[PDB]
């Protein structure tokens, strides 16, 4: 159960990482940037950084 992009939301099966999080949203292959607890989180650390479930992630895209 995590803060997610303006809304309050559920997270299925408890244990998990950021890599996982983008799996349920359909942009595992796309372009994205993501910020956990006003701390920026990058591409290369994707497997290694685990969700401490309850916290703040801000996802963004490149738009004109």
């Amino acid at each position: 159960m995590l803060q997610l992009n303006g809304k309050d939301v559920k997270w299925k099966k408890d244990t998990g990482t950021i890599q996982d999080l983008l799996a349920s949203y359909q942009l595992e292959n796309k372009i994205v940037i993501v910020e956990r607890n006003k701390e920026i989180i990058g591409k290369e650390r994707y497997h290694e950084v685990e969700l401490c479930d309850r916290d703040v992630i801000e996802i963004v895209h490149f738009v004109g």
């Binding site: 372009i31 940037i33 910020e35 920026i40 990058g42 963004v60 895209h61 490149f62 004109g64």
Partner: protein
């Protein structure tokens, strides 16, 4: 050549990527430009231009476009390096709802603290002859004064002021903001500019493809005049 932060680029044209009529056109305009250096800034599937693009041949110029605070700006900057594709920033503090002109205090303040954490900084500034100097007087490797306001292609509304900028600075100078046609692009270089950054003229052209090519010539032509000679304005009694 034009050389910013110790790397050089054979094209003194820098082209933006905002607000084209279609990707098919943005893609084409960008090639036709011969640019190297382009600035960048839950839903549903669509192409993103940067990930349909080879990243060797270009030199990315992120901007802080959307910040009001040098705070808000500092993030978009560090948010940049998190992607790890860029190693060069454009400093842009829009402060006026009506004109979109640089904020002298935040643009300066923000330029200082980005420069600590080994950033390559080139800010968007005014044409306050001094405000150029001041920014540059704290290690800035290229100063970027704006010829007009942003969205409206009014060209160099003041030479002199910018003609001063040229004479006094030791790093490169690139006019951005508000170029409207080659006529304007080429005027910049003639007073000694090292390059022109421009979006709206090309994107909004209604033949951005053509207009891309035209700008590409303009900058060259302009640079060649200055390169050597130029008939004096002839006076009469």
């Amino acid at each position: 050549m034009l050389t910013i932060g110790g790397k050089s680029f054979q094209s003194r044209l820098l082209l933006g990527t905002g607000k084209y009529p279609s990707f098919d056109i943005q893609k084409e305009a960008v090639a036709v430009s011969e640019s190297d250096i382009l600035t960048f800034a839950f839903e549903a599937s669509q192409p993103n231009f940067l990930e349909q693009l080879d990243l060797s041949k270009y030199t990315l110029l992120p901007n802080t476009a959307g910040a009001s605070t040098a705070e808000e700006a500092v993030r978009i900057a560090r948010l940049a390096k998190a992607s790890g594709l860029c190693d060069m920033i454009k400093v842009e503090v829009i402060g006026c709802s009506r004109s979109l002109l640089p904020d002298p205090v935040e643009t300066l303040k923000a330029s200082e603290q980005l420069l600590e954490e080994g950033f390559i900084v080139l800010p968007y500034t005014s044409d306050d002859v001094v405000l150029a100097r001041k920014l540059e007087e704290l290690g800035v490797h290229a100063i970027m004064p704006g010829a007009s306001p942003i969205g409206s292609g009014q060209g160099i509304l003041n030479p002199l002021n910018l003609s001063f900028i040229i004479e006094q600075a030791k790093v490169p100078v690139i006019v951005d903001a508000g170029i409207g046609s080659p006529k304007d692009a080429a005027y910049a270089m003639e007073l000694g500019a090292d390059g022109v950054l421009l979006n709206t003229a090309v994107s909004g052209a209604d033949d951005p493809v053509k207009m891309a090519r035209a700008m590409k010539l303009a900058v060259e032509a302009g640079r060649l005049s200055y390169e050597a000679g130029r008939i004096p304005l002839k006076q009469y009694g």
